[PDB]
């Protein structure tokens, strides 16, 4: 068992094993640090008050369960996890160690002239990562460029860290049923912004958002109005100047016509028609990169915990178990 050392960092105290040197803040909260066991440079997040409340403690436990299960290269992975505590009773603090990645898709897209080749490779890696996540019955629900870690090899990982811009219409008419293809909506929103340099749908709020979305894809016709339960929603949507679906080739006129088509298949209002990750990875656009023998799915994820109402000490303790049974990767 490791031997620790304490430290005063940006108000916050920090106690991590000595395998970790030259901790310096990056913005719970995060330090860039040096992994002496591996030479490699890592991210260390101290969760902020992991067990302050039921919602906190269940979050913390969901956090540890998600990171622990994620083993794919376009998705954040967990190198190490630790607490300074020796007992369940002591147990108050949780630290997460992960690959240092530094920059996000924002830090790229706003200061590098992007080819169509970058676009292809960046979307392809989102989608392959989305495939793996979707296969475990996890929906991300918040895909946006700050949730995509990109390195200098332009190599990409998904994680969780203006939301509404990338959100499906149906998650703004708080529907709660969502298929996985809320994520393919965000992906479409992201790809377009790469091709283009501009936010596809910069709603000024959740009312604007829909105006803006409807302007491009058009108001829903009969087949779609059928599936809308709420008297509210239908009353709102049916209450607009009925709108034409715009011609994507016009909207994204200079773009690669294969990327355009893919957007069409991605930004479909009725989420039964949205292409999936597995299907997009096959679209012509990614023929440079596609490889059906290198597009793994995830082991089954047990997430029945999600519907337990538990006390702080049960979540806590479950979290402790989880820290304990941690085996590093290979
Ligand atoms: C909550 N969550 N969900 C996912 C997905 C959906 C991609 C599996 C990933 C995460 N969690 C994180 O991304 N957690 C995390 C931990 C340390 C750092 Cl430096 C940054 C982020």
The CA angle 127-133-139, to the nearest 5 degrees, is: 100
For residue 211, with 0-12 CB atoms within 10 Å meaning exposed, 13-18 middle and 19 or more buried, which class applies?
Answer: middle
Q: Residue 121, CB half-sphere, CA atoms under 13 Å: how many?
A: 12
Is the Cβ–Cβ distance between 205 and 164 less than 8 Å?
yes
Look up tokens 């929103």; give the residue.
Answer: 189
Q: Is 28 annotated as a binding residue?
A: yes
Ligand 1 in contact with 97 (CB < 6 A)? no
Residue 70 CA, closest ligand 1 atom number: 8
Residue 43 CA, closest ligand 1 atom number: 19
Round to whole Å and give the CA distance between 70 and 238.
Answer: 42
- For 41, phi then psi, to 5°, come to -105, 130
Which of these CATH numbers, 1.10.510.10, 1.10.3470.10, 3.30.460.20, 3.40.250.10, describes 103-297? Answer: 1.10.510.10
Is the Cβ–Cβ distance between 152 and 107 less than 8 Å?
no
Within 8 A by CB and 6+ apart from 314, the residues are none
The 3-state secondary structure of the chain reads CCCEECCECCCCECCEECCEEEEEECCCEEEEEEECCCCCEEEEEECCCCCCCHHHHHHHHHHHHHHHHCCCCCECCCCEEECCCCCCCCCCCCEEEEECCCCEHHHHHCCCCCCHHHHHHHHHHHHHHHHHHHHCCCCCCCCCHHHEEECCCCCEEECCCCHHHHCCHHHCCCCCCCCCCHHHHHHHHHHHHHHHCCCCCCCCCHHHHHHHHHHHHCCCCHHHHCCCCCHHHHHHHCCCCCCCCCCHHHHCCCCCHHHHHHHHCCCCCCCCCCCCHHHHCCCHHHCCCCCCCCCCCCCCCCCHHHHCCCCHHHHHHHHHHHHHCCCCCC
Structural domain 14-102, CATH architecture: 2-Layer Sandwich (3.30)
Round to whole Å and give the CA distance between 161 and 154.
Answer: 20
Round to whole Å and give the CA distance between 330 and 322.
Answer: 18
Cα 162 to chain center, whole Å?
A: 14
Round to whole Å and give the CA distance between 296 and 117.
Answer: 23
- For 2, phi then psi, to 5°, come to -35, 160
Residue closest via CA to ligand 1's atom 20 equals 161
Query: Taking the domains of the chain in order of start, what are their residue ranges?
Result: 14-102, 103-297
Dihedral sign for Cα atoms in the order 294, 300, 306, 312: negative
Alpha carbon distances (Å) from 174 to 108, 135, 146: 32, 24, 23
Ligand 1 in contact with 63 (CB < 6 A)? yes
Residue 150: both structure tokens together: 């990109």
Ligand 1 in contact with 208 (CB < 6 A)? no
- Of 32, 266, 19, the C-alpha closest to 143 is 266
* Cα 70 to ligand 1 centre (Å): 9
Round to whole Å and give the CA distance between 223 and 4.
Answer: 62
Round to whole Å and give the CA distance between 54 and 74.
Answer: 31
Residue closest via CA to ligand 1's atom 12 equals 160
In units of Å, what resolution does this entry have?
2.6
Ligand 1 in contact with 66 (CB < 6 A)? yes
Rounded to 10°, the helix 116-135/257-264 angle is 30
Q: Is 30 annotated as a binding residue?
A: yes
* Cα 133 to ligand 1 centre (Å): 12
- Residue environment code for 274-305, b if the CB has 16+ CB neighbours within 10 A, otherwise e: bbbbbebbebebbeebbeeeebeebeeeeeee
Q: Residue 140, CB half-sphere, CA atoms under 13 Å: how many?
A: 33
Look up tokens 């990750």; give the residue.
Answer: 277
Ligand 1 in contact with 70 (CB < 6 A)? yes
Residue 161 CA, closest ligand 1 atom number: 21
Is the Cβ–Cβ distance between 127 and 281 less than 8 Å?
yes
Q: Is 26 annotated as a binding residue?
A: yes
The CA angle 205-209-214, to the nearest 5 degrees, is: 155
Residue 170: both structure tokens together: 């149906």
The 3-state secondary structure of 250-301 reads HHCCCCCHHHHHHHHCCCCCCCCCCCCHHHHCCCHHHCCCCCCCCCCCCCCC
Ligand 1 in contact with 76 (CB < 6 A)? yes
The total of other beta-carbon atoms located within 10 Å of residue 212's CB is 17
Residue 142 CA, closest ligand 1 atom number: 6
Q: What is the C-alpha radius of gyration for the chain, rounded to an integer number of angstroms? A: 22
* Cα 46 to ligand 1 centre (Å): 13
Round to whole Å and give the CA distance between 174 and 2.
Answer: 47
Q: Solved how?
A: X-ray
Active site residues: 160
């Amino acid at each position: 068992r490791p031997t620790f050392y304490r430290q005063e960092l940006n108000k916050t105290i920090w106690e991590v094993p000595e395998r970790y040197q030259n901790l310096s803040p990056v913005g719970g909260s995060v330090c860039a640090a040096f992994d002496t066991k591996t030479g490699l440079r890592v991210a260390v997040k101290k969760l902020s008050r992991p067990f302050q409340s039921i919602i906190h403690a269940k979050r913390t436990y969901r956090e540890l369960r998600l990171l622990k299960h994620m083993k794919h290269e376009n998705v954040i992975g967990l190198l190490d996890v630790f607490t300074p505590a020796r007992s369940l009773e002591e147990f108050n603090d949780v630290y997460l160690v992960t690959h240092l990645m530094g920059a996000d898709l924002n830090n790229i897209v706003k200061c590098q002239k992007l080819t169509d080749d970058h676009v292809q490779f960046l979307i392809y890696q989102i989608l392959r990562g989305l495939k793996y996540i979707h296969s475990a019955d996890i929906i991300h629900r918040d895909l946006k460029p700050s949730n995509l870690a990109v390195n200098e090899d332009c190599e990409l990982k998904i994680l969780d860290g203006a939301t509404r811009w990338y959100r499906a219409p149906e998650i703004m008419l708080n529907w709660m049923h969502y298929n996985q293809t809320v994520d393919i909506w965000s992906v479409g929103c992201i790809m377009a912004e790469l091709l283009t340099g501009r936010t596809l749908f910069p709603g000024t709020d959740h009312i604007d958002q829909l105006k803006l979305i409807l302007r491009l894809v058009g108001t829903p016709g009969a087949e779609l109005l059928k599936k809308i339960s709420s008297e509210s929603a239908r009353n709102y949507i049916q209450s607009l100047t009925q709108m034409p679906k715009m011609n994507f080739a016009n909207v994204f006129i200079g773009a690669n016509p294969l990327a355009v088509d893919l957007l069409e298949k991605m930004l479909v209002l009725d989420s039964d028609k949205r292409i999936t990750a597995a299907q997009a990875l096959a679209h012509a656009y990614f023929a440079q990169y596609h490889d059906p023998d290198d597009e793994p799915v995830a082991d089954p994820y047990d997430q029945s915990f999600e519907s337990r109402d538990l006390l702080i000490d049960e979540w806590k303790s479950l979290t402790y178990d989880e820290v304990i049974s941690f085996v590093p990767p290979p």
